[PDB]
């Protein structure tokens, strides 16, 4: 079809988490659609043991925004790797005649799908 | 980035598995670079188990064109499913002055991702 | 007297505020008395209007810790100085027979001082 | 840091004042670095009202020495408290590269501070 528009985000970087680690923590990400057309976006993480999203996925109007929340659980930074956590956001514009649900589908078939990618920064 | 370019296939929709299946068939595909950038490409299919690619994934540049070979082994068509079967293609630009080698981080960044299905389609 | 033992925190260095800041936020801090001797600590903010602590200050036998929160109201970040916000932590120790009780006074004496900085990182 | 050196005064315990209170007095005192390194020193009464200093801080290398003026004005012993006035003294070592100038800061940043108390004596 044609490119999808972009969106905006709160962070619209990284994302920190501050330590202390003993306490499951939740941040918040704020998702705009920077668009024309309704757009249809769900994120992964790196670390579905740790971080946690909320919800994970749905659909935007143009101008609309959504606010999602971020956990991460108690961890021992003294041990665990803490360079290699991402958080992603993937979208893609909806089906001509398409209702307020996410459909998973709507990346499987053919198509263009964008990215954006939010790194965790882990603050001891 | 900027959206990628089209691609050509052929078959350009579908690709047929005749019976009988009791030996290693070998089809062939045809990739198209229509765009006017270079690309990156990469399949994926949905039987790791059957199926078969080669070369899995590369570089066009515009106009250039590739021939990759799709196997399959043998099998039971009593048994298994055959409706489920399916030839996944991804594309994207290539970074602006880049080698050609394919490079799986391409993807993996923040930008544009293009994909395309070929369905298999067993007759028996 | 005799100066002071040493602190920990967590974080150690720096404490990141996260937009959006269109909600009160909530931080954490842990406070560790690493020192041989009781001690008493107070908080000092910079900006009495968008911070908030609590507990303000304390009592920390040795090995003790505390958890105290910091908060953050609402504000915008577009007119705002975002450079010269700062987390003071003051201490010394206790006199020879105390009470867990903060006394100002500790501090109005005659003796020695402790200052630990945590200044705050506005992400955007 | 490292905890500060010790300093000498003149007089070294407490400071009298002898009557008669009908005119301003003028009394001295001698602060002596004792220690190895610069230092930042700065003095506090409890009356502002009454008493005056200067100078009211400053810098003094190592076995330097300074000779400060205490005020007294006139007043009222037979009704006003003459129990609670105070002379205070604070001091700090200095940042690696200082220059011989008084800086406030130096104390409201990361470090310790000493003190020492001089009480006034009220003479009738």
Same mark, same amino acid.
């Given at each position: 079809?044609?490119?999808?528009?972009?969106?905006?985000?709160?962070?619209? =970087?990284?994302?920190? &988490? !501050? $330590?202390?680690?003993? +306490?499951?923590?939740?941040?918040? *990400?704020? %998702?705009?659609?920077a668009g024309g057309?309704?757009?249809?976006?769900?994120?992964?993480?790196?670390?579905?043991?740790?971080?946690?999203?909320?919800?994970?996925?749905?659909?935007?109007?143009?101008?609309?925004?959504?606010?999602?929340?971020? =956990?991460?659980?108690? &961890? !021992? $930074?003294?041990?665990? +790797?803490?360079?290699?956590?991402? *958080?992603? %956001?993937?979208?893609?514009?909806?089906?001509?005649?398409?209702?307020?649900?996410?459909?998973?589908?709507?990346?499987?078939?053919?198509?263009?799908?964008?990215?954006?990618?939010?790194?965790?920064?882990?603050?001891?």
């Amino acid at each position: 079809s044609v490119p999808p528009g972009d969106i905006n985000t709160q962070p619209g =970087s990284k994302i920190v &988490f !501050n $330590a202390p680690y003993d +306490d499951k923590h939740t941040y918040h *990400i704020k %998702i705009t659609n920077a668009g024309g057309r309704r757009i249809g976006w769900a994120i992964k993480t790196t670390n579905m043991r740790r971080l946690g999203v909320d919800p994970p996925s749905g659909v935007l109007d143009p101008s609309e925004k959504v606010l999602m929340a971020v =956990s991460c659980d108690t &961890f !021992n $930074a003294a041990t665990e +790797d803490l360079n290699n956590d991402r *958080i992603c %956001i993937e979208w893609t514009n909806t089906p001509d005649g398409a209702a307020k649900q996410f459909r998973r589908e709507w990346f499987q078939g053919d198509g263009m799908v964008r990215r954006k990618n939010l790194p965790i920064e882990y603050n001891l």
